[PDB]
Write a protein that binds this ligand. Structure first.
Ligand SMILES: NC(=O)c1ccc[n+]([C@@H]2O[C@H](COP(=O)([O-])OP(=O)(O)OC[C@H]3O[C@@H](n4cnc5c(N)ncnc54)[C@H](OP(=O)(O)O)[C@@H]3O)[C@@H](O)[C@H]2O)c1
Ligand SMILES: O=C(O)COc1cc(Cl)ccc1C(=O)NCc1cccc([N+](=O)[O-])c1
Length: 315
């Protein structure tokens, strides 16, 4: 089954294309190829500074009569320097204009941490400390709600929120919209059982990012664990006559998660979609879950003093 039901009545494709680190030089072709081999879900963000070129590819394929807009599920995220109430609509409209779209299917608060407003996406002081803003999760949420009520986005959600921060929103007096999605890091080294359990028990759909371990993350150390090269996972792949990436993509799919693997390589975009023709076994699933090391690709020491830093909490 290709799509999962959101609490706003819309259906979200469970496999989408990630675009973080897809060079503007190469992401238009990536998205074009993706659409051609069946992707309908693209995960974007303003901070990825490639939304224009993503938009280029979508516009063309609409022009080519390959897909219709209603068939596409486009996601973007509000960046941290835009959490102020008065900045949210603008930030959304910039993303929309960049993507050459009239609406987004899903708009996420990218991180719970508000940063000092300005051009700089990551304002720092002088001990690697991020300069926060005097914003909070509740007021930002209300600003997102307004986006729905003005037709700019069909659904809103969060990303990198811990369970207490999700609770804050759920329990907000005067809540208009429940978050539809919480997009978090998830893979066999960070299996997220308690947070998934929590969100799923709230009717909030979970999207797994960095499902392949983000080998191209710009802060990688050669000593860090490498999922795509893990022998134990290669072994599971070979018994299924699939690649390790295919296994890493299929795994969250069988946990009722959405997954959004990134590639700019045409061969890999096509391969990564070919995951609806095999099933991981019960023994495979518990084996992969047992690799959890609580290891994060995405966690900034420069943010660990921010009041809304998400990862002090167990989950
Ligand atoms: N909400 C947030 O905070 C957040 C944070 C991180 C990521 N995300 C989203 O999640 C997406 C996925 O995560 P990610 O970009 O961190 O990393 P990922 O999807 O785990 O890994 C992408 C890396 O894997 C390589 N790769 C892809 N398919 C492969 C295959 N079949 N075989 C071997 N290598 C393969 C890619 O290389 P090539 O591209 O060179 O082929 C790229 O270097 C992002 O792009 C973004 O959309 C969201
Ligand atoms: O966030 C992503 O989607 C991918 O990671 C990116 C991508 C781009 Cl273009 C620029 C910067 C980052 C990054 O350092 N994200 C991590 C991060 C951010 C904010 C707070 C935190 N935090 O831990 O509080 C972590």
């Amino acid at each position: 089954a290709s799509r999962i039901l959101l609490n706003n009545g819309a259906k979200m494709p469970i496999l989408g294309l990630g675009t973080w680190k897809s060079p503007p030089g190469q992401v238009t072709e990536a998205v074009k190829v993706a659409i051609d081999v069946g992707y309908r879900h693209i995960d974007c963000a303003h901070v990825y500074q490639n939304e224009n070129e993503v938009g280029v590819a979508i516009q063309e394929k609409l022009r080519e009569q390959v897909v219709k807009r209603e068939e596409l599920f486009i996601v973007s995220k509000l960046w941290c320097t835009y959490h102020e109430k008065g900045l949210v609509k603008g930030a959304c409209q910039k993303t929309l204009s960049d993507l050459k779209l009239d609406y987004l299917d899903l708009y996420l608060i990218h991180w719970p941490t508000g940063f000092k407003p300005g051009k700089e996406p990551f304002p720092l002081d002088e001990s690697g400390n991020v300069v926060p803003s005097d914003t909070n999760i509740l007021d930002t949420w209300a600003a997102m709600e307004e986006l729905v009520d003005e037709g700019l986005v069909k659904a809103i959600g969060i990303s990198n929120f811990n369970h207490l921060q999700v609770e804050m929103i759920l329990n907000k007096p005067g809540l208009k919209y429940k978050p539809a999605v919480n997009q978090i890091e998830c893979h066999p080294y960070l299996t997220q059982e308690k947070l998934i359990q929590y969100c799923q028990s709230k009717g909030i759909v979970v999207t797994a990012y960095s499902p392949l371990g983000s080998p191209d993350r710009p802060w990688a150390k050669p000593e860090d664990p490498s999922l795509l090269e893990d022998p134990r996972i290669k072994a599971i792949a070979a018994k299924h006559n699939k690649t390790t990436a295919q296994v890493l993509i299929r795994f969250p799919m069988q946990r009722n998660l959405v997954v959004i693997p990134k590639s700019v390589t045409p061969e890999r975009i096509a391969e990564n979609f070919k995951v609806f023709d095999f099933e991981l076994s019960s023994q495979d699933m518990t084996t992969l879950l047992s690799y959890n090391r609580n290891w994060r690709v995405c966690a900034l020491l420069s943010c660990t003093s921010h009041k809304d830093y998400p990862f002090h909490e167990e989950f």
